[PDB]
Amino acid sequence: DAFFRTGSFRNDGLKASDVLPILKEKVAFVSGGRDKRGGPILTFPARHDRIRQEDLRKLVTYLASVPSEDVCKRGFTVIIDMRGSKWDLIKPLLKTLQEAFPAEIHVALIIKPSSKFIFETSMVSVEGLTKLVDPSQLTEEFDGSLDYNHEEWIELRLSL
């Protein structure tokens, strides 16, 4: 406590440059898409290289700060694509969000290939997503029409 910083990254003023390697890996992204309530969408697309827990905590802390304060106030819709994956590879993402995500999670929607978290979780089909999110607000992976270029987004964030 005299040399090393420990605990939450909430007040560390993380920038895209602080999380650049994991941003490039596209473990998670904030497309700009909004759910039907007006809340922001945080996406974890289909992943096998093990990631460092601290890198994931920094990533979700940074991504929580991406939407405007008013949009964030409605809480996030988290979309996790589990198609071609397993529960043992999804549960650690939910645990890290519960421990490190500095904003409210309204609901975590898991695309089916249970509910012991502080936020609501729902096992849904890629079509069941459209009940809570308009397809114009969903990216390509979920048969949506929202244009989102992750590499371009990173370059614009680095210019902030």
Author numbering: 19 to 65, 68 to 133, 146 to 192
Extract from the study:
The neuronal RhoGEF Kalirin, a central regulator of cytoskeletal dynamics, contains a Sec14 domain (KalbSec14) followed by multiple spectrin-like repeats and catalytic domains. The N-terminal CRAL_TRIO domain of Kalirin is followed by nine SRs and a variable number of RhoGEF (consisting of DH and PH domains), SH3 and protein kinase domains.
We obtained diffraction-quality crystals of KalbSec14, a construct consisting of the Ex1B front peptide (residues 1–25), the putative CRAL-TRIO domain (residues 26–182) and a part of the predicted A-helix (residues 183–192) of the first SR. The asymmetric unit contains eight nearly identical protein monomers, with an overall root mean square deviation (rmsd) of 0.8 Å for 175 Cα atoms. An N-terminal 10-amino-acid extension (residues 18–27) upstream of the H1 helix projects ~18 Å away from the αβα core, confirming the notion that the Sec14 domain of Kalirin lacks the CRAL_TRIO_N domain found in many stand-alone Sec14 proteins. As such, the interaction of the C-terminal H9 helix, which is part of the first SR, with the central αβα fold buries 441 Å2 of solvent-accessible surface area. Nevertheless, an elongated groove is present on the surface of KalbSec14, directly above the S2 and S3 strands.
